[PDB]
Amino acid sequence: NDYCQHFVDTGHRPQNFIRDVRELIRLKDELIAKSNTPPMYLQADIEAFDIRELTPKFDVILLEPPLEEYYRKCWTWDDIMKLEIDEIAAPRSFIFLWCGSGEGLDLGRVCLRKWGYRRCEDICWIKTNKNNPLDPKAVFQRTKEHCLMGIKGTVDIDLIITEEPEIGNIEKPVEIFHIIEHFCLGRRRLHLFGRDSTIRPGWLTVGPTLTNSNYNAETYASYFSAPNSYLTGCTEEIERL
Amino acid sequence: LFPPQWICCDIRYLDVSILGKFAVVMADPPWDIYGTLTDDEMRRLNIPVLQDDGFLFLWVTGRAMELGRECLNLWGYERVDEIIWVKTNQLQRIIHWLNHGKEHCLVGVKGNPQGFNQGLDCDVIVAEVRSTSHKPDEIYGMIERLSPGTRKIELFGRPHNVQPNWITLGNQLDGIHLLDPDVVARFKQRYPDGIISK
Ligand SMILES: O=C(NC[C@]1(O)CCCN(c2cc(NCc3ccccc3)ncn2)C1)c1ccc(CN2CC3(CCCC3)C2)cc1
């Protein structure tokens, strides 16, 4: 049975027919939650903000620039490529870059190389249209977004399947945080262009639409001072007193 | 000429200028990530002669996600879409840092194709994995709906890949099977003894 033909016949995307969209990966979930730092967050216009003010250097950076394609203040790949991401990434670190579905698949790769990463995974967010069975260069109907994973220095599948959000909803699937956190990459986690709705324990969220800030560089750094400097985020607390 | 055609050959050494122009090219190269091609051999493939206006479908994995984009651009294409095939078992369940549930196929455009049916299919294929390295048959139907009745060429195909409207090239095909008279004629001129060397 040919779900591509079926999509042409009915408008139901082939991904609508994927089924099921260990057991100890829950104790790991619990360890992540225990070692998570308090959520921290800062309202900042990133185009005007000096990124170096954000210390210390991060083990993982989630970068979610509001692309024009997300809408039926937008950032172009021109603006994104000029971010000084390498000035705040730790020498060993990871980046997760939401690239959309168009030119970003190429320009996001340029950005990764520009900032000193190599791409190690291509995570595809496949959007189903079960509830509801156009770019001029497009050859096909675009039904997915890519989040590229980059590594610099020295359990999960690479797919996320959810229903296509309502038009004008720019949110990305929260599943991406689960994939990232399950890697156990360290505890200094930055989300650029996050929002009030994405603030999360274990994460420093920075973005222009935050309504409130609680970020203090010295407070933030105190979460990773010895004995806690090198934890993965997947291990027990270190006993004190 | 509608029925399947194919040439057993070393794609490095074949003079592809005898094949004419094609509306769609598809390649599934043996990337060096066995019979592979070095990066430089891939770059020097004479893809530019195969089309004037049309689409290239280029399977990529690992670091060929980047190297394939390079080849695509060097050969004169812009990448305008990216198909993924989600690999399922027969019950529609999905099969370094992450386990891989999908294969990628870059879609490049050259020139300004006119009269293609853009937007008929979407960029996700959901299909059962079969033999190793075997691409899903859905791609041919997608390509047929996109460009019905036009000439197409597949590089590094295998015998199971032969299709009407397609000429298939690969070194595990059974001999040479050409029916298009334009092609037959140019093949005889270029290869009067039927041999493809150097
Ligand atoms: O099996 C294959 N394809 C037929 C050949 O025939 C085999 C043998 C070399 N190959 C050649 C090579 C060649 N020239 C150079 C040469 C010749 C002799 C020795 C060394 C080098 N000329 C013609 N065919 C192709 C093949 C196998 C895996 C992949 C990878 N994809 C990823 C997917 C999986 C899901 C869809 C996409 C498969 C691609 C193709």
Throw out a few tags for this protein.
heterodimer; A: 241 residues; alpha/beta; Rossmann fold; 8-stranded mixed beta sheet; 8 strands; globular; B: 198 residues; 9-stranded mixed beta sheet; 4 helices; binds ligand VAT; transferase; mettl3; Inhibitor; complex; dimeric
Can you give a write-up of this model?
Chain A: Residues 19-20, 101-102, 119-122, 137-146, 155-158 are annotated as: Interaction with METTL3. The complex is a heterodimer of chains A (241) and B (198). Chain A has 241 residues and is of the alpha/beta class. Helices cover 20% and strands 23% of the residues of chain A. Chain A has an eight-stranded mixed β-sheet with strand order 1-8-7-2-3-5-4-6. The N and C termini of chain A lie far apart (64 Å). Chain B has one domain. The two termini of chain B are 28 Å apart. The complex binds ligand VAT. Ligand VAT binds at residues 10-12, 28, 30, 35, 37, 59, 61, 103, 133, 135, 156, 158, 170-172 of chain B. Residues 10-12, 28, 30, 35, 37, 59, 61, 103, 133, 135, 156, 158, 170-172 of chain B line the site of ligand VAT.
Describe the structure concisely.
The complex is a heterodimer of chains A (241) and B (198). Chain A is α/β, with parallel strands linked by helices and 241 residues long.
